C-alpha cells in the first residue's frame, strides 16, 4: 500500500529488502504531507530564493547561433549556489528530514557533486552528514572530498565491488536500513526506489516552471524543444516536468555516448541497455548478458550512473520524450564552443545537451527552431580534464 | 513436487529437534573448493542449505558476504556455473532441502518464469529474492508456485500485523525470521496465521543461540555469515578450513537436538 | 580640462604620460554620455540580469550568529557569473568600448580573476582581448590562464620589474598609449587615473543599491554597517556608494593584514602606507622610504594591489568610512567558519570582510547590530591553498 | 640661475649647429662604470645630458630602459646615490646642461619643493617628470622655477593647439618633441608661441635622423634608447662598450654640424 503510484508504466517500483519498506513508506507519507503544507512550500522557496540564488537566468546565445535560424537559450543552473542544479533537491530533502524529526543525513556520491551538495545543505540546516564514496572515486575527486570535509561532512570510502558510484549506492542503503529512525537517505538523482523518483522531480521542477515563465516573457511562445543531459535523470526531469502537458514542446534527453555506442564504452542505458532490477527499481541499465551490473563510461564523471530514472524510461516508451546520445568528442567540442563564443564554461555533463543542440542547429541551419538547453552546472571542475585531452593532441 | 522442507520438518518434529541451515556463497572461494565445502556441511549435520549466487551489487548483504562474492567473482563464477553446481549437489544428496538466496535481477534477467523453471529442473527447493518485498512479490511467488518452488520471505523485527499476514499467506517452505518488537509475539502470530515454519536468522553464530531460537518457538536457525567467516579466515589452508567447518556445524546441529 | 572632478579631496588625479591624456579624455566623455543614455543603461542592466545573474541574493546567516545579538547578512556576489563581483564592471566597460567604436580589449591581472572576467566579457561581446600577466603570477595561476585562453583571450607574460600585478599594470598602460585608437584598457579595480575610479564605482554600485532594497525589504531598516574587503577598492566602493549619504550607516573596509602589520608583510597601504604617485594617481601605497613601490603580501592573491582607490583614501580622511585590517590567520578561520556553519565557501579575499564582522560580533556579543558583509567571490579557487596550510599543522 | 641651456643654444646657433643629447640611466650597469660612460659621452661631443633615475615602475619607458633600470637596481643604485653621481658630474663639467628624467613619486616622496631644491644644490638644469601631464604640472613646474630648474614637457605627435600653447607657456630649457599630425606644423607652432627650443626624440638612432630633425626646424635631437642599447650589448667588455659609445656619439654629433 502506497499513497502514490510507484510505477511509471512498467518502470519503477520499490525493490528493496523488506526491512527498508517502513523507511520508504514513512518518507512517502511525509513528502505527501509536505507537498500540501503551505508553510513547507514557503520555507523551501525561501531557501531557494535567499540562499541558493533562484530564480536562475535564461541566457540568449546570439553569437553561437549566428548565420542560422536557431534561437538558443540556456537555463543557467550553473549560477546556482554550489555550481549545479543538485542544490535544489538536497535543500528540499533536508527540509523533509527535519519535518520527519531526523537529525542525520546519509548520501552517496560518485564525481563528488552530490556529496558537496548534501554537505552544504546539511551544514546550513544543522544536520550531521555522512557520505559514502567509492575509493577509486575518492582518489579521483580530492577537491570535492575536501569541500565535503570543510563543510563538516564525514566521508566514508567504499572499497567493495568496483569501488565506484553504484557500490557507494549499495553501502548507503545498508546504512539506512539500520539507521532510518534517526537518519534520512538523501538520494542524489531521480532514480532508485519510490518515492525518490517522484520526490527528486518535484524538488527539481522549478527549473522547467521558471523556464516556461521566462521563455513566455522573452519570446511570447513555448520552446520547440528543451534539451538536458541524462545521468540519473534529475536535471532533465526537472526541466521536462512542467512541459509534459504542452504536447507541442519536444523533450530531448541526452545520454553520454562515451567513446561511441558501438565501442561498448558509453553510459546510455535508456537507449542501449536492457531492462533490469537494481537499486530498488525496474529500469534500463548497464548490464552484462548474465545480469551483472556494469559501470557507465563517460568523459564526464557526473554521468556515471549505470541506470536511469524510471519516469524517463516511461516517457520514452510512450513517445512523449526522445532520447539521444553524444560522444566524448562531441561534448568536448561543445565545451570549447561555449567558452569561446559566450564566455561560459559549462560542465562537461551539460556539454552533452548543448552539443546536441548545436547538432540540431548545424545539421538543418535553415530550420526555424527555438531551443532551450538546461545548463546544469559550471565547468571549472573540468578545465584540468579538458587541458589534458587537448595537449594530448596539440 | 517433492515436498523436501515439509518432509524435513516432519522428521525433525518427530524427533524433538530444531533445524540448522548454513549459508554459503556458491563458488566461494572456488568451484571445486565450494563443492567440497558444501559436502562437508551436509556431512557435518546441516538439515538444509541456503546458497547464494554471486551478484555484482548485493545491496542487502553485510561485508562478510560482500567479500565472499568477490572471492567467487575472482574465481570467475557465473550464474550458469552455479546452476551446474546445484545439479551436481542435488545428484549427490537427494533429500536435503536446497534454498537459493537470489537478487532480483538474476531472477528477472532471462525472464522470471524461466528462472524458476530452471530451479525446478536442477532440484532447487526454495528461492529467497533478497530485494523483493512482499509488496512487489506477485510475479515472483506466482512463478515459484507454478514450478513447485517455495518462495521464502523475510519477516523483519519491525513487522506489523499486515506484513505478518502476507508473509504467512505468501510464503512456503519456511519463514526467514530476523528478530531478537517482541520476539515471542512474531513467532506465535506466524503460527496463529498458519505461516511456514519460522527459522531464526539474525545473529546465529554460537550453539547457544541455536538452542535459544528453538525454545522461543522457532523451528530452527539459519547461520547467515558464520560459515562464510570460517572460509575467509582459513583461505591459506583449505584442509583446516574443512575441519573447522565440520567442527562448527556439528556444534550448531547438536545444539538443536535440545 | 575634464567634465568630472578627477580628485577626491587630495587623492586621485591623472598622472600619466602626456601621450595618454587624449585616451583618458575620450574615455571620460564617452562614459559621461553613456551615463545619460537610457539605451546604454538598458543594455547594461540586461546583460547583468540575463547573462550575469543579477540581482544577487542577500543571505541571512542564523547559525553563525547564534547566541549573540548580531544579525548578519551576506551580499552574494559569489553567485555572480564568473564567481566574483568583477563581472559587473567588465560588462560595463566592454559596452563602453563598443560605444567608442573599439574592437579590442587590454587588461592586466594578478591572481587571474580580472583576466578571466575581461576574457568572458570580450568573448560575449565580440571583442579581441589581450591580457598582460606577471610571469610569476602566470606560473602560480595556471587554472585561470587556461580559462582565459579557452575563452579566446591572448595571455602575454610580463617578466619586467618584479613580474607581478604592478608590473602587469605598467605593461598594459604602455600598450594602450600606442593602441588606444582601436583598443580599450579595461582596468580591473577602482584605482588608477581618472576617470577609472569613477567609472568602476558607477559600474559596481548596483551591489549597494540592491543591498539597500533587500535590507529594507527583510528588516525594515538600513544596516548598522556594511563591510567589504579592500584590494583595489572596487567591491567595497560598489557596496559603499549608495550608503554614503545615509550617515547612520557605517562603512568598514578591510585591508589584508598579511602575517601582521608589525611584520611589514601585509597589504594595507591605506592605513599603514604613505601617500604617493603611481599608476596614474595620488593615493596611499606600499613604498620604501626611498619611494620605490613594493608589493602587497596577503595569503589571498586577489588583495595584492599595492595601493588603494583614491575615493577610499578620501572617505577615510573625512571620517565617513573606517578601515581596518585582518591577518591571514583571521581570514582562514573565517573561511572555515562559513563553510562549516553556512555551507558557503567564500573567497579568501571576502574572508577578510567576514572575519572582521565575526570580530565585531564576538568582541561585543550583546551589542545589537545589523551587519551586511559583501561576499565578493566564491572560494573554490582557494581550497588547495587552505588544504596546504591546514595540513602544514595537523 | 646659471642659464646653461640658454648659453648652449646661443653657442650652437652662432655656429649653425644642432644639439645632440644622449639619454642614459644613472648607475647602469654600475656606479663607477656609469660615471665612465657619462664622461665618454661628454668627451665624444654630447651637448647636454638627459639622465634617468632608476624607478621601480617606469610605466612610460620601453623595454630597453626597463632592463637598464634592473641592471642599476641589481647594482644597488638608489636615488641618493644618483644625486651623489650628479654632484661629481657637475664638478667635472661646469658648462654642460644636465637634465633629469624623473618619475613623479621620486619627486613627490620627500616633498616636491625639497626635491627641486636638491636639484639646484647639485647643479641640475632641468627636470622632465615622465608621468606628469601639463594638466597636473602646477606644483611641479612652480617648484622648479622657484629653484632655477627648467621644467621639461613632452609635446606628443597628437598635440592639439591648446596643448601646444601650454607646453610653450609652461616649459623652459627645451621642449621634448615626439613627432615624425604634421611635424613641420608642431615645430613652427611652437616657435610661433615662443616655446623653448624643440628637441626631437622619437626614433633618433642614426646620424641621418639627427640631420633630418634639424632641417625640419628642431634645434636638435635626443637619443632616447640608442645609447642604452650599446651598453646592454657590450656588458661583457666594458672597454669595447666605451669605444662603441665614443664612436656612436661622434657620429651623431657630427651629423648635427650639418
Ligand atoms: C550530477 C550532474 C548531472 C547528472 O545528474 P542528473 O541526475 O542526470 O541530473 C548533470 N549535470 C551536472 C552539472 C551534474 O553535476
Ligand atoms: C579581485 C578580488 C577582490 C579585490 O578587488 P577589489 O577591487 O578590492 O574589489 C576582492 N574579492 C574578490 C573575490 C576578488 O576576486
Ligand atoms: Cl540566430
Ligand atoms: Cl538571481
Ligand atoms: Cl543572532
Ligand atoms: Cs545514465
Ligand atoms: Cs590594497
Author numbering:
A (entry chain B), C (entry chain B): 2 to 395
B (entry chain A), D (entry chain A): 0 to 179, 191 to 268
Quote the authors verbatim.
We also trap reaction intermediates and conformational changes in macroscopic crystals of tryptophan synthase to demonstrate that the spitrobot enables insight into catalytic events. By contrast, the spitrobot is built around the SPINE-standard, and versatile time delays have been demonstrated. While true time-resolved crystallographic experiments at room temperature offer a much more complete access to the dynamic landscape of protein function, cryo-trapping experiments may be sufficient to solve many important biologically relevant questions—e.g., provide insight into thermodynamically trapped, stable reaction intermediates. It is clear that care has to be taken to only use crystals of highly similar dimensions to avoid that mechanistic conclusions are affected by different diffusion times.
